Amino acid sequence: IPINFTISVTTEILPVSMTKTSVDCTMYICGDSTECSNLLLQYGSFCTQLNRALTGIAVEQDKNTQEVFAQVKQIYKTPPIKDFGGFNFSQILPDPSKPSKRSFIEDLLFNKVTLFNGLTVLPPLLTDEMIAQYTSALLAGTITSGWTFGAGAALQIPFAMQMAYRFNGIGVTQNVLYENQKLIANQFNSAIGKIQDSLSSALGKLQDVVNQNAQALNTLVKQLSSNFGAISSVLNDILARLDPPEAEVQIDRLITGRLQSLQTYVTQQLIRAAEIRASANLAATKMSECVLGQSKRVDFCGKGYHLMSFPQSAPHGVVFLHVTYVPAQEKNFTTAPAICHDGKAHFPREGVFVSNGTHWFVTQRNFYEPQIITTHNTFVSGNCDVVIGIVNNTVYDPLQPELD
Amino acid sequence: TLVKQLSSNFGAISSVLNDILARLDPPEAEVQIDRLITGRLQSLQTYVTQQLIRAAEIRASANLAATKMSECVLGQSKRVDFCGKGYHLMSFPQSAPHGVVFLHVTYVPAQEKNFTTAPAICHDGKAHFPREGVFVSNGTHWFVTQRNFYEPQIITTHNTFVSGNCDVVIGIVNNTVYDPLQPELD
Amino acid sequence: GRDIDDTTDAVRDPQTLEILDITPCSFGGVSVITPGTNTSNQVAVLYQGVNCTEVNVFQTRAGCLIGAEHVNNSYECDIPIGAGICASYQTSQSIIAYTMSLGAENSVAYSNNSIA
Ligand SMILES: *[C@@H]1O[C@H](CO[C@@H]2O[C@@H](C)[C@@H](O)[C@@H](O)[C@@H]2O)[C@@H](O[C@@H]2O[C@H](CO)[C@@H](O)[C@H](O)[C@H]2NC(C)=O)[C@H](O)[C@H]1NC(C)=O
Ligand SMILES: *[C@@H]1O[C@H](CO)[C@@H](O[C@@H]2O[C@H](CO)[C@@H](O)[C@H](O)[C@H]2NC(C)=O)[C@H](O)[C@H]1NC(C)=O
Ligand SMILES: *[C@@H]1O[C@H](CO)[C@@H](O[C@@H]2O[C@H](CO)[C@@H](O)[C@H](O)[C@H]2NC(C)=O)[C@H](O)[C@H]1NC(C)=O
Ligand SMILES: *[C@@H]1O[C@H](CO)[C@@H](O[C@@H]2O[C@H](CO)[C@@H](O)[C@H](O)[C@H]2NC(C)=O)[C@H](O)[C@H]1NC(C)=O
Ligand SMILES: *[C@@H]1O[C@H](CO)[C@@H](O[C@@H]2O[C@H](CO)[C@@H](O)[C@H](O)[C@H]2NC(C)=O)[C@H](O)[C@H]1NC(C)=O
Ligand SMILES: *[C@@H]1O[C@H](CO)[C@@H](O)[C@H](O)[C@H]1NC(C)=O
Ligand SMILES: *[C@@H]1O[C@H](CO)[C@@H](O)[C@H](O)[C@H]1NC(C)=O
Ligand SMILES: *[C@@H]1O[C@H](CO)[C@@H](O)[C@H](O)[C@H]1NC(C)=O
Ligand SMILES: *[C@@H]1O[C@H](CO)[C@@H](O)[C@H](O)[C@H]1NC(C)=O
Ligand SMILES: *[C@@H]1O[C@H](CO)[C@@H](O)[C@H](O)[C@H]1NC(C)=O
Ligand SMILES: *[C@@H]1O[C@H](CO)[C@@H](O)[C@H](O)[C@H]1NC(C)=O
Ligand SMILES: *[C@@H]1O[C@H](CO)[C@@H](O)[C@H](O)[C@H]1NC(C)=O
Ligand SMILES: *[C@@H]1O[C@H](CO)[C@@H](O)[C@H](O)[C@H]1NC(C)=O
Ligand SMILES: *[C@@H]1O[C@H](CO)[C@@H](O)[C@H](O)[C@H]1NC(C)=O
């Protein structure tokens, strides 16, 4: 049975969206030429399908971001009085001096990743300032209300009482929090300090996406200096050295090669967009279940027993700081399934029977605090010749002394 | 798009095969035939790839619908914002063309009331914590109520459990406990 | 002279022997914002990749929207132009271009001994 506990904070990185890109089908293949375009019309509509697919991906990215981050009806605001019972959300809450209104850790994350021939790059619908605003709203609502704001109107509650009700949902009683408030506050502050110190010395999940999206474009651009069997990989050179009767057997080879290149690029982008969409769905689920509530699913929101989580915004992704509860120091005890007092068998109501060698106590499972075995902790069921490992200690019956 | 791709030259002299076979003598028609074959193979090979990707997406959506039917309809789920917004009670399925429609019934609170609250009650040196509920006050007296609906009750020895003494809890107030056994004891 | 992707971006003229650079002329796509051909027949064209120096002219980060008045208020997003800008028909009636608002500004009366 554990005797002590520790509070641990761990991070989790998830991509959400990738850069929008629209590639022209005619300018990439031909350029400013007209004979090339007139030849290209013989292939039907292979320049509408690609544009339609790329626009579909571009719209899907904005839908991903919107469904992940826009989960709050109203933009809540943190009160000026920062008396949260000892907990220090200073590196989490925004600092209203920088023009971007981003907290310390969000800046550490934004300064760790960052440092026409048809191709264009479109801007995201939600600029980074608005995403920071959304995460600040989520944090202020979580801190000042709890899980209430995600299930209707927001109800205020002191932070210490909220953490008491967070402990009460994992088995540990609430006097454990109220009698060890300073220790828990110190451990949480130390954990936040370690997180900020370890984010400044990584983020491979958010970089293996940018690397792939960049090498795809690099290959697409480099597939424009290939002859593909013609005499030269320049339309303006071919058109200046050959009469029209004898240049359309060369431009045709160029057209075939460049069409195949575009088709390969579009197929790969479609598959990658599907993968990013799956990850964005997971990120939205994690937000809804770990931030706006407390999750009983094992290993979903961190490692340990979940208490609460805080979101932060990273470039083209999101960051969660899961706060858990892990038992620390255990000790050996001796246990009995039941107790035969007076021909009856007393089972514990909520707890477990332990003994240090001489006397028998009843205690909760996730923490060590022994108690006398009264009739308010146990209930009777049958006689004591059926249970396999029953011991024969005594109970207290707290009405007998008062009946004198 | 797949059907309309059948009316393109692809480099041949016409987009219809019968004209190719009628207007030209066999050994010199194979060039046109090959150009048409290449074009139509390209069309019917792009269509299948796009269809496969769409089918995978629909499969993921169908898996989600199956999970929602299993966990929202056949039971009551504690996952937040999974079976609708608010606290979940039950759900009912309805069939729609190539899809499902769930009707999620949810409990959601209403008109609020601010109160004054404390985390413990120090009766006679001992500290009393609420058993299942929260301590509140209307200004003068103290009650214990459930956390999701106002329903105050007199603080007793059955609504609270004792732990330690009233010297370590940060915020704590003085009040009394009923001890219902005493009036019947006399 | 060349660049990262093997494209001539500089040249020396044979006669004067002077260095000249080459920059491609401005390109870009054209997108049109319409409120639906059941309410009105007005539109608002938006060059995507060019400033307004080239061909009611509001220059935006996403391009150079033409034909839409700029307002100061903030509403929900009807037509997502981009970079935080949205356009809508509901202002006799004209197409406007505002900045998207995320929601109402709320604030809970948090304190250490108050519950709701
Ligand atoms: C609930 O009360 C708060 C303030 O609590 C007051 O003192 C308590 C000890 C208790 O006795 C309450 O009954 C008292 O009312 C008030 O919050 C204000 O709400 C108004 C709403 O228009 C807002 O403008 C103020 O800014 C709020 N106060 C602060 C300091 O921000 C109000 O009476 C009630 N608020 C809610 C949300 O129910
Ligand atoms: C449970 O563990 C905490 C720390 O994990 C202990 O708190 C430390 O106690 C020692 C001795 O009293 C102090 O020197 C330290 O400053 C305390 N804090 C830390 C962070 O080490 C606590 O004493 C343990 N509980 C018991 C019952 O021993
Ligand atoms: C097991 O724990 C119990 C209670 O913590 C110990 O019982 C106490 O023993 C002392 C020794 O004289 C008595 O003065 C107390 O009255 C006993 N009860 C309590 C509640 O303190 C017992 O000694 C422990 N046994 C071992 C082997 O450590
Ligand atoms: C707060 O609750 C207390 C507890 O009921 C109220 O006090 C009693 O209220 C009833 C109903 O009006 C009266 O009949 C009793 O005489 C009251 N008892 C006392 C000792 O005053 C109280 O009225 C409620 N409201 C306030 C503002 O205190
Ligand atoms: C709740 O916060 C109040 C502040 O609103 C605390 O009161 C402060 O500290 C003492 C104690 O009464 C007094 O000087 C003032 O009421 C406040 N001080 C200042 C400088 O404003 C109170 O201690 C807190 N109570 C609990 C239980 O957390
Ligand atoms: C919170 O931490 C910052 C720096 O880590 C410090 O300046 C500030 O005083 C702390 N606030 C509290 C209430 O401990
Ligand atoms: C419990 O006893 C076993 C065997 O005697 C020992 O190996 C183990 O370390 C003990 N547990 C603790 C927490 O000391
Ligand atoms: C465990 O095993 C030992 C020896 O094998 C036995 O004496 C004891 O009764 C067992 N405990 C039970 C059955 O609870
Ligand atoms: C416990 O003590 C009682 C004394 O009345 C005895 O009858 C019973 O056999 C004991 N139980 C065991 C398991 O020895
Ligand atoms: C509760 O009563 C004790 C004993 O009279 C007193 O010392 C203490 O100050 C009281 N509580 C408060 C909050 O004043
Ligand atoms: C002929 O070209 C040379 C550069 O090679 C230039 O210096 C010279 O001025 C030119 N001749 C005339 C008459 O301008
Ligand atoms: C046009 O709008 C009116 C009302 O705004 C509606 O009654 C009518 O059905 C609409 N017609 C079309 C073709 O959308
Ligand atoms: C368009 O003109 C404005 C005004 O001079 C200038 O600030 C802007 O940089 C120009 N656009 C580009 C792409 O250079
Ligand atoms: C609108 O904003 C501009 C600049 O932001 C300002 O000059 C103008 O007075 C404002 N008009 C109104 C009606 O607020």
Author numbering:
A (entry chain B): 714 to 828, 855 to 940, 944 to 1146
B (entry chain A): 961 to 1146
C (entry chain A): 566 to 620, 641 to 676, 689 to 713
What's the paper's own text on this?
The SARS-CoV-2 spike glycoprotein is the major surface antigen of the virus. Its function is to bind the host receptor ACE2 and mediate the subsequent membrane fusion required for cell entry. Here we have examined the structures and receptor-binding properties of spikes of the B.1.1.7 variant first described in Kent, United Kingdom (now termed Alpha)10,16–19 and the B.1.351 variant first described in South Africa (now termed Beta). Recently emerging variants of SARS-CoV-2 have acquired other substitutions in the spike including a number located at the monomer-monomer interfaces, at the receptor-binding site, and near the furin-cleavage site.
In addition our structures of unbound, uncleaved Alpha spike suggest the trimeric state of the receptor-bound form of the Alpha variant spike might be further stabilised by the substitutions D1118H and A570D on the inter-monomer interfaces, as also recently suggested by Yang et al.. Two recent studies showed increased RBD erectability and enhanced receptor binding by the Alpha and Beta spikes. Spikes of both variants have the same mutation, N501Y, in the receptor-binding domains. This substitution confers tighter ACE2 binding, dependent on the common earlier substitution, D614G.
